[PDB]
């Protein structure tokens, strides 16, 4: 067969893909990236006894009654005020330091201001010691590890970094990706009336947007014609430019002008060039060593057909991006769902059927789960099959018609928030 | 109770949130945004009879045998070459125009080159007319609508825009969001040794990263102290700056220095300020009209506690962002999952329990599905409960202990690709 299964091509790319060296970035540059160090709190949270509620800090043993407001301790006070002796209370807001001597905080809804212009308040409930008080370090202990290496940084992790005072973060960067399209029939997407035999370059803009969705820097190398020396020149510039991944579209098939596959066999080590899969078949993966520091560049000879180009990106390039970016779980999300319509599977090649999936309270069998609708015809040239497709149905090469209501595996390729 | 349920607060914000006027952006600026017009193909795809395979364009009636290669039609040729008469073939690559007279294409694996230096090839199979030929418009018909209004633009949609030659796209923009934190105890996250009663501002950096994850422009207004005139000045500048959403952290509780809620009642129309929910309770939503063009600004008085601040962002601000951005389905993804551990629900307030959910081939009952682990203590001040939390368990106010293995509803707040 010469071609390898998709599970083996993934294992080969996984074994070659190496995590990028960590870098130091600012707080907002660290969003979305994977932590490359442990984060320890230099001080506890809260660093002082803080009030949970707005109200009055009391002595729990005094109980209900009328007491003078001996002092006020709002959020922002230094806490070094008057000691709340038994028989006295202190007004506190949320986050306000608990004055020395207070054992609990009574909610302001459980109090009543007595008198007017010397202030006295009436505690209306009997509270126990420690009520509505955040002890020192109750949320975050001092020197405790709030964030560990390998953890991806989201919005909550950014707040934890700001809580610990970390504004320069050591993370694993995103790979720089160079993208180019091959084909003498390609013209820029700005072209109006097409010439004879000309089509607009769709893969390059598609791969650019796809790499952008992976939060990687894109190096647009433009349209390259089906010329051996030209493709060799662009690849040498791409390898020496400092990129980590090179994405090529087209030129890896069986035509006598497909120079992407041979050139990758010449400049680097091609691990495979054909994969048993639907859609498509040609897919060249090579490891190129930049000749100088010394650097390894991964090359993905993606097929020229728009569907196979984007599918091979979602299955092989996306995990390579995350693995280089330091993800501990680079694999995409895989779920089980029901089929909303009958689908005929290929008898030879396991198909990655494009589908629009959604969560239903009744997936067709009385239980909540995912259901998938087919996007239509699945030819590798019909980019409309990728339109609004958020999952890839992993159909096995059985040749049988999977009726509606059967369960298949699906690779989710984007957030499916469309309820 | 004075406070309204979460379903009603969402209905109020949904009824006030208005979609932003459409703008014209470039191709790469249109990524992630919602289409505000229909996209029609100015020319078919392919615009010419294109070969699917690399091989030879033949006359299907001639059948197998030896034939001369009368011409070559690779990808990039104008297609106005020599007519392939019966008894002749033409070499074609993938995307190459089909010469006039050819009815089918024979795969090069089904051919053999005969002779050498005049070229002759041997067709080894009997093919039917139309095999391995992309007819004009088979993938995309001319004047057909490839993209419709209200469709969010992903990588595949970008390729469709480049296919149709649309480099300037009419989309609905993202709202500009202004963010500020309130609190006399707040210091910048760059502060080292904290002073007495000081904590580092975590909500602002957290909300900035959260709004950035929504692909919105952030207007950082910084830390504002608990001063009535100061907060009034910052809000007047924020309303007149041109932002669409104002996010405030803190100053909406019961303390005598909480000026966010009263000021929003003064400059705009506050629709609610307390919500029946856990964590938290105070949450002020107001609509402010910018006094000049005329503009409506939505204000979210988020609570100061870090957990309640981020939770109220995920439930109320995120759909408001998407609704302003033109999303037809602004609601977050809601699924059903099993509990990996027993959880005690609040008897009064329905809780949004932070959880780390994952898809398992066996969710604990023999069927594949989602399972959720609790993040630990769910106090509104313990931001560690938000750490790596990707779902919000919608626990009902029943006071009963939901044992492990029971099914609850969950709001997914980020892509859960962690397999
Ligand atoms: Mg080609
Ligand atoms: Mg406050
Ligand atoms: Mg998801």
Curated annotation (Swiss-Prot), chains A, B:
Q: What is the activity-regulation note?
A: Inhibited by copper and tungsten.
Known cofactor(s)? Mg(2+)
Q: Where is the signal peptide?
A: none
Q: In which pathway does it act?
A: Cofactor biosynthesis; molybdopterin biosynthesis
For this protein, what reaction is catalysed? adenylyl-molybdopterin + molybdate = Mo-molybdopterin + AMP + H(+); molybdopterin + ATP + H(+) = adenylyl-molybdopterin + diphosphate
Q: Tell me a GO biological process for this protein.
A: Mo-molybdopterin cofactor biosynthetic process
Per UniProt, subunit arrangement is: The G domain: homotrimer or homohexamer. The E domain: homodimer.
Output this protein's name: Molybdopterin biosynthesis protein CNX1
């Amino acid at each position: 067969t010469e071609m390898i299964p998709t599970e083996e091509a993934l294992r080969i790319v996984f074994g070659v893909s190496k995590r990028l060296p960590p870098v130091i970035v600012s707080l907002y540059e660290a969003l979305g990236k994977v932590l490359a160090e442990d984060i320890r709190a230099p001080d506890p949270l809260p660093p002082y006894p803080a009030s949970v509620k707005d109200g009055y800090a009391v002595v729990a043993s005094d109980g209900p009654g009328e007491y003078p407001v001996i002092t006020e301790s709002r959020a922002g006070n230094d806490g070094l005020g008057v000691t709340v002796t038994p028989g006295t209370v202190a007004y506190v807001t949320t986050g306000g330091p608990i004055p020395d001597g207070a054992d609990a905080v009574v909610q302001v809804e459980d109090t009543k201001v007595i008198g007017d212009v010397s202030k006295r308040v009436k505690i209306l409930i009997q509270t126990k010691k420690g009520t509505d008080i955040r002890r020192v370090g109750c949320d975050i202990e001092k020197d405790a590890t709030v964030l560990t290496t390998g953890e991806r940084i989201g919005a909550s992790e950014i707040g934890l970094l700001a809580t610990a005072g970390v504004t320069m973060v050591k993370v694993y960067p995103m790979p720089i990706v160079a993208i180019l399209s091959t084909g003498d029939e390609l013209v820029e997407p700005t072209a109006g009336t097409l010439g004879r035999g000309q089509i607009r370059d769709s893969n390059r803009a598609m791969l650019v947007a796809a790499v952008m969705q992976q939060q990687c820097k894109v190096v647009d190398l433009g349209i390259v014609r089906d010329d051996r020396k030209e493709l060799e020149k662009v690849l040498d510039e791409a390898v020496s430019s400092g990129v980590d991944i090179i994405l090529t579209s087209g030129g890896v098939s069986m035509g006598d002008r497909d120079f992407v596959k041979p050139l990758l066999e010449e400049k680097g080590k091609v691990y495979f060039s054909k994969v048993l899969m639907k859609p498509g078949k040609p897919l060249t993966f090579a490891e190129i060593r930049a000749k100088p520091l010394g650097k390894t560049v991964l090359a993905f000879g993606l097929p020229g057909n728009p569907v196979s180009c984007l599918v091979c990106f979602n299955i092989f390039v996306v995990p390579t991006i995350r693995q280089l970016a330091g993800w501990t779980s680079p694999h995409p999300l895989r779920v089980r769902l029901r089929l909303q319509e009958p689908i005929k599977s290929d008898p030879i090649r396991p198909e990655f059927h494009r589908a629009i999936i959604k969560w239903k309270d009744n997936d067709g069998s009385g239980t909540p789960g995912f259901v998938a609708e087919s996007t239509g015809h699945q030819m590798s040239s019909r980019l409309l099959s990728m339109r609004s497709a958020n999952a890839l149905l992993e159909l096995p090469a059985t040749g049988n018609v999977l009726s509606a209501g059967s369960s298949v595996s699906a690779i989710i390729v984007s957030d499916i928030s469309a309820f």
